[PDB]
Nucleic acid binder design. Structure first.
Lengths: 96, 93
DNA sequence: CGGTGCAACAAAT
DNA sequence: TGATAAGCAATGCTTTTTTGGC
DNA sequence: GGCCAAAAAAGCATT
DNA sequence: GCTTATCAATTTGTTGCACC
């Protein structure tokens, strides 16, 4: 799996960024996306996809193990809608 | 917030890095993420989320506009699962 | 550079 | 598991965003 | 940095 | 219109990555 470390090293090799600035930049990148979503804002990354917020109202649930009918509290969740460019790129891929 | 707006925000915060490098860095990270998925490998960033590929069986679909049948092949589609920190921080309720 | 502890993970249930 | 919510097959037209030069 | 027009990508219809 | 995803609780095993 791709990790931050791997992403950092890649910026180092490809752009010559210092292993320190590279590491900080990767982290700031994900944090900035969380901040926007945290502030109720949509995040649209052209060529990749969109991180959208959806508000859900409580609905019927239960314990998968026991079966005790427990409700699913209402909540605001983050979703990702991959764009067409990215979808085309991975359609014929295969789990490595 | 769009990709350019994100780059603008990062640039301001990373004053020690030339705006240009930040922009090149963001474009590079996104390609590294897309490329990883195209290679059929997952992405797992603790506290943000993980991206994986979901399989879609072949099926007889339709051109929703005309109603004509279309034969679709099996395929894989990206899928994102938000992480704990992100779920919490995002959930206003 | 590399070693370690562990909340965040995945998957079963 | 099971009630409920979300996403999508084709594709032409519109709108937004990016790109690259000044 | 902005301004511009052309291209790329997304958005819409409905998806 | 039909298909896929959301989610509930707990246990068990894996890993990103902060820290040393």
């Amino acid at each position: 799996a791709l990790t931050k470390a791997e992403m950092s090293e890649y910026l180092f090799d490809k752009l010559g960024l210092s292993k320190r600035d590279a590491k900080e930049l990767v982290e700031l990148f994900f944090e900035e996306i969380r901040r926007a979503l945290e502030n109720g804002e949509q995040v649209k990354l052209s060529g990749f996809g969109n991180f959208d917020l959806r508000d859900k109202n409580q609905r019927p649930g239960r314990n998968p193990k026991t079966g005790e009918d427990i409700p699913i509290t209402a909540r605001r969740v983050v979703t990702f809608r991959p764009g067409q460019k990215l979808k085309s790129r991975v359609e014929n891929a295969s789990p490595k | 917030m769009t990709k350019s707006e994100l780059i603008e925000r990062l640039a301001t915060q990373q004053s020690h890095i030339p705006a240009k490098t930040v922009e090149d860095a963001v474009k590079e990270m996104l390609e590294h993420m897309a490329s990883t998925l195209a290679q059929g490998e997952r992405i797992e960033i603790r506290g943000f989320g993980s991206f994986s590929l979901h399989y879609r069986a072949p099926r007889t679909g339709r051109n929703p506009k005309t109603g004509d049948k279309v034969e679709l092949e099996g395929k894989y589609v990206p899928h994102f699962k938000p992480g704990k920190e992100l779920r919490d921080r995002a959930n206003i309720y």
